[PDB]
């Protein structure tokens with residue numbers, strides 16, 4: 001009864017809070033770490049992550065407006081294309097850069113000599129382009145296949161129209177089921193499994209090394225490590241699991257209407273997943289003494 | 300005359316590129332400040348391949364060691380120049396506990412001044428307690444009460460050296476940001492340089508953790 | 515002869531000609547007043563003839 | 568006989584103090600009570616010179632008031648064009664522990680020095696096209712704290728070995744040695760006629776030396792801690808010292824006494840550098856508190872603040888035409904203000 005309305009507006013308010021906090025925090029990180037601090041490898045990584053999160057959260061009002069009226073698109077074809085391009089590029093870049101930061105920290109901790117001899121700002125700038133290239137490659141079907149479809153009652157949904165690529169009245173089956181299944185599998189494997197495995201393995205190695213070397217004086221290192229790992233997991237795993245379940249039950253969901261719970265769990269879980277964009281600056285940037293000192297000295 | 304303006308801008312950009320490359324090369328070295336006594340012996344140990352600089356390489360890590368023993372002037376006027384070194388190596392002759400103001404007392408005062416210094420709040424200190432064999436030979440004929448009247452242990456090298464190590468590490472009034480790595484210097488090959496490598500590796504790891512945000 | 519050098523230096527320093535602090539202050543004021551118009555930091559120059567924009 | 572000599576020295580010091588007090592009749596603040604305040608000196612960062620990767624310890628302006636040399640502990644001596652922020656030169660130093668640098672009045676040479684106890688002279692013309700070490704001066708047993716060119720062939724260096732020296736660059740020999748201090752000399756300033764120079768040391772005293780003769784003409788005292796900086800008044804009859812006791816002072820050679828003290832209760836950090844303006848009306852002083860303070864040199868007031876650096880302001884200079892002020896800092900940046 002009333003609980004359904006609560007589940008209706010809960011993702012909306014979560015996304016609005018995410019928009020406000022993400023814009024504020026990512027703008028603060030960009031300003032400070034790009035115009036008041038010396039350029040280092042960690043500063044470059046934080047700047048790239050902040051740019052991804054900020055560009056994603058700047059598109060959040062459009063997604064909130066679209067979701068509030070039942071996935072309808074009130075804007076134009078160009079805005080549908082541009083907004084979804086930005087969303088995909090920056091949402092994949094966020095997880096790729098989180099994995100990149102985890103790998104960089106693991107290398108710095110486990111091979112300090114190699115990090116001292118080879119980890120430089122120029123090399124970091126050269127190699128941090130890889131996550132962006134992978135995100136851009138994953139965003140290609142948004143460039144090509146996505147478009148705005150107007151169903152008879154002028155409803156204007158921005159979806160993956162396949163009529164242009166089809167040639168038969170059965171061009172939906174085996175051409176859209178296959179594409180959506182591949183999309184969901186890639187989403188789970190590359191959007192969640194790869195960055196999650198990288199993050200977990202790297203931070204577990206860091207924790208084990210600093211425990212064996214007896215560097216744990218306070219609880220702060222372990223608190224920060226567990227917060228960084230658990231925030232990524234708690235934010236992304238429910239949404240990725242729901243999306244993967246929808247992928248593996250796609251045919252028997254759309255053909256007959258079996259799993260409606262997976263259908264109605266998409267919005268709250270996706271809002272929780274997108275909350276990580278506003279969570280990231282607090283986890284990675286507003287945890288450093290030097291950054292906090294520079295921020296308070298700047299304002 | 301704008302061709303010369305573009306030529307000047309090009310030359311400045313080339314100089315900028317050279318400066319960036321030179322800074323990248325320089326940041327790769329590990330800067331060590333050597334203070335102290337067996338300082339020359341330690342330098343000879345770390346000897347492979349106004350102020351005197353000694354460069355060596357161990358396990359693909361490059362160390363630049365600076366000796367400022369020939370600076371008879373006031374230290375506080377130039378000591379800030381070494382704010383930012385990876386670590387400080389402090390040499391103390393264990394056999395100075397007999398020599399006279401007591402030599403070991405003067406060494407303790409210098410160590411206290413260096414360790415509790417506003418420019419070295421977080422800099423780690425590698426303390427070498429040299430002349431172990433001479434100290435062991437002298438500890439059987441001159442008791443540590445000659446230097447420390449409050450000592451109560453037997454005239455044994457182990458106890459009389461543990462006391463000195465503990466009472467040198469007690470002068471660290473900031474055991475929350477810096478570490479003191481104490482090594483009893485021995486003539487064993489590569490031992491002191493391996494100890495320096497281990498301590499510097501720990502310092503580098505801790506600096507990386509601080510920079511990332513864990514520490 | 516460090517003591518002799520100190521004695522000679524102090525004797526030479528004492529056997530010097532000193533003037534009034536009022537006279538010295540007047541000279542400093544006169545110099546500052548004479549060269550005030552030519553001081554670009556005391557009186558900033560217009561941006562047309564300012565080399566640093 | 569040592570006791571009698573000490574008593575005689577004490578009575579001579581008493582006589583000198585009595586003579587100074589007798590010649591002291593009016594104060595600088597009393598004489599300048601009538602004059603109007605300068606106002607509020609508000610300078611703006613016109614240029615920001617970046618490119619040093621470590622703390623900047625010294626800088627000097629060229630006589631043409633356009634080129635400036637700076638020294639950093641990254642082992643670099645950079646010559647900049649201040650108008651365009653173009654790096655004209657970048658000389659690598661054999662010793663990275665540089666503490667001072669000088670620009671020749673002709674602009675043909677540059678100088679540097681530091682913890683190596685050596686003043687290095689660099690030829691800037693170099694028709695071959697590459698800056699070369701023209702001469703290396705040795706003989707100081709302490710760190711090089713300051714150096715200033717008299718000509719293309721003469722340079723005066725103050726060292727931490729308690730002495731100062733006037734050199735012959737062509738022969739590389741100490742032409743004259745100035746002794747008398749009892750602490751490390753940390754700064755020196757040449758008179759406008761290059762006939763005398765003042766030096767401030769860690770014994771909390773300043774001394775005036777005749778270059779041609781080589782003896783201490785006058786000794787000025789009154790600071791409580793080490794004098795870190797010293798500068799000459801433009802007319803050459805007075806000078807200003809900045810020390811670690813957070814005060815600057817103005818001394819008069821002719822009256823042989825202190826004139827004015829520049830200090831505020833809100834300032835507790837020492838002065839790193841001092842520099843007059845073209846008329847001598849403004850005294851700019853660098854501080855450890857990351858700021859430069861512009862003082863009214865006549866009324867002892869504070870006329871302005873330059874606050875643009877994140878670390879110590881170690882070097883400070885005013886151009887020969889008085890147009891701009893360059894301020895170098897430990898945050899690895901130089902800033903030109905107007």
Ligand SMILES: CCCCOc1ccc(C(=O)NN2C(=O)c3ccccc3N[C@H]2c2ccc(OC)cc2)cc1
Nearest residue numbers: 063087088091092095138141182183184186187191192
């Ligand atoms: C054959 C396929 C090749 C390309 O592979 C894929 C697979 C899946 C997607 C995808 O889900 N994009 N999103 C959308 O549609 C969206 C649409 C509206 C609002 C938010 C969205 N969030 C992204 C998104 C979700 C999860 C992510 O995890 C890191 C990243 C981005 C995009 C491309």
